[model samples]
Target chain A: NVTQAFGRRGPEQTQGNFGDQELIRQGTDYKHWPQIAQFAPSASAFFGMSRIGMEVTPSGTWLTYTGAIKLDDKDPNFKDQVILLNKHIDAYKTFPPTE
Target chain B: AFGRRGPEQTQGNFGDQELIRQGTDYKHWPQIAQFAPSASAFFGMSRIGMEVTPSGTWLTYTGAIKLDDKDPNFKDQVILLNKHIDAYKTFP
Candidate 1:
């Protein structure tokens, strides 16, 4: 599942770029967290997670949700790392989000 | 109350140490399959990830894998597991 923590404070940080941001989205495909699928929350909760907007996808048996939380950290290195990881995972999964 | 054993107790040798031990062992039992990273690879994966550390086990990735709650299949999967993982009552 995707967890987009806004800023440094996570969901608590409510007024920043990442603030009021999206956390998890099931997207188009639906093949991740098979067991927990039964426990999956509302579609609105998954999508429209925040006003910022985000997307997610699922793989064979694993769903790798990824989204960005805008933050204003001084170091660009950390910021870059987040981007790298997001993109990395996005590429790893061949399946696209299903509606 | 709910009988002498309370709601927590069962009939016969339900409280026996051997039975508890067996149940625990069954829960701990691992499926046989290849390994991967992340939480699932640790427990739900093949070969139980404990006994067959090297070989591992693999299961069909099909079925409802969405946690969307909107998906009927996904919802059923959760209800199904709750009978064991989180529910208080179960059927024999």
Candidate 2:
């Protein structure tokens, strides 16, 4: 049976960060590839990547995390009725009692 | 939060730390009188940082706000504090 390989890598750009694709290739030569010619794709190899990351700042952007998450209008009520039924729809799912 | 100190505790290091101005105002924390709440009311008050009992009040850190005597339990407040905490879990 043929042995398998595993690797990981990080971002390549700063406009946004955490580019999982480039991170995995940073220190690898991929010796599994063929000669200096065309490298055929392998069906057994699973390549994946992600671009989700963040920007940080000190005086640049003042943010606060008070180690507390509060309940909101979207929270399910005692009788399970929508609390904020007249509010504008948001693009994200609202969570209640978040840690 | 009351504390005691003397030269014997830190070997004459009394000046090393800040000292509390103790006086007649000092007393056991529980002796203080404040508003008390019913069992249901106490539960709601606790949600807002107020410590209470069915019989009497309890001591809590400063800035502890008590709950309303009657709350409709309708969470109607809205604040779009962040559109990004919904995005990345970590930062660069």
Candidate 3:
């Protein structure tokens, strides 16, 4: 039984490298939060999540959607790309912005 | 609303602990595997340095190991516990 499968980030295109960048795709949304939190349990045993992107689940298996998701409307960085653990909040970033 | 909980997943319970055990302990709870580093590729300074700690226990019941769960990495042998390490990690 598949357990905590998720779309990996980067260009390697391997199973671990899912290659599509679905997990770290540029964009954000509350719709994607549950998926992010779902994988959070493993956070206890694992490390090095910056290299990985997050998949939303059943729906994320195919095309993980990307868009602006800001719970706090006052956020100055609203409508920015979603990069977990990323310190940068501005829209501008170097090529290949990762989480 | 931020952190969620469950019956057996309550704080401090054996089920809620994030410490990894030997052998079959993995069957009851899903955790990370060393393979995550090699199999997964990174870019820039991404969260690749991020590590899961007991702090992640907040997500205990948010999601659990299931028979049919398709979490992507699950098929590879381990599950990813990305955030809960820092507010920056959960940025959205």
Candidate 4:
């Protein structure tokens, strides 16, 4: 459901890249977000690593994820979607085992 | 470094045991030896990125760190890290 809602949008308008480009590309198992709006009245969505949505860098020995949810203040259902998105974010935080 | 419990030894706790219980034996994983709690004992060993076990260790997130080890764990570690970076003395 999360992927479905945001998937409708294109990369240029939906996905965001706050990380280093070369590092993100060099890392293995690259993942992407569907369509996440940066501001209101568009779409409320999630971003981070893999299932959660994020890009890993090449500099460190640690593995990490960067996640964020965008809210649409103008949408009539924005409030409800905010709550739903919060729940989804919480669910996404529980990463699975890598071993 | 891999087998050493640096953070646990120096900081006293960083949820290393809990992370181990979750199946991440960083204590023995040479790859993550530097970020291991024991490694914290070394001077200037700051947390640059974070690695989640069972997930590929080759990948690292650097913007902000989310302390996944916290109780009632928050959703985004980056946001958490950004907010708590000052108070966050060490990694878990």
State which candidate has the highest TM-score. 3
lDDT of 4 by residue, A1-99 (tens): 222322211123122222222212322222322121212111011110111212335532222322222233567765554443233222322435458
The lDDT per prediction is 0.24, 0.20, 0.27, 0.26
TM-score of 2: 0.13
lDDT of 2: 0.20
Model 1 residue runs over 4 Å out of place are A1-8, A11-99, B1-66, B87-92
Docking class of 4: incorrect
In the range A1-99, model 1's lDDT, one tens digit per residue, is 232321121212121111011223332132333432322222222111211111234432322221112223454554453343233222313334456
Candidate 2 vs candidate 4: the TM-score winner is: 4
Candidate 3 has what TM-score? Answer: 0.20
- Candidate 2's residue-wise lDDT over A1-99, tens digit each? 001122111122111111123222431243421221121111111000101112235423221111111123243451222212111012012323337
- Indicate the DockQ of the complex predicted as candidate 4: 0.04
- Model 1 residue A40 lDDT score: 27
- Winner on lDDT between 1 and 2 is 1
lDDT of 1 by residue, B1-92 (tens): 11111132121111222222443244422210011123322112111101112333111111122235455565444333332221222222
Q: Residues B1-92, candidate 4: write the lDDT tens digits.
A: 12322323212112234333443343332322222221111101111222234432221211222233453533444443233222223444
Candidate 4 chain B worst ten-residue window by lDDT: B38-47
- Predicted model with the maximum lDDT: 3
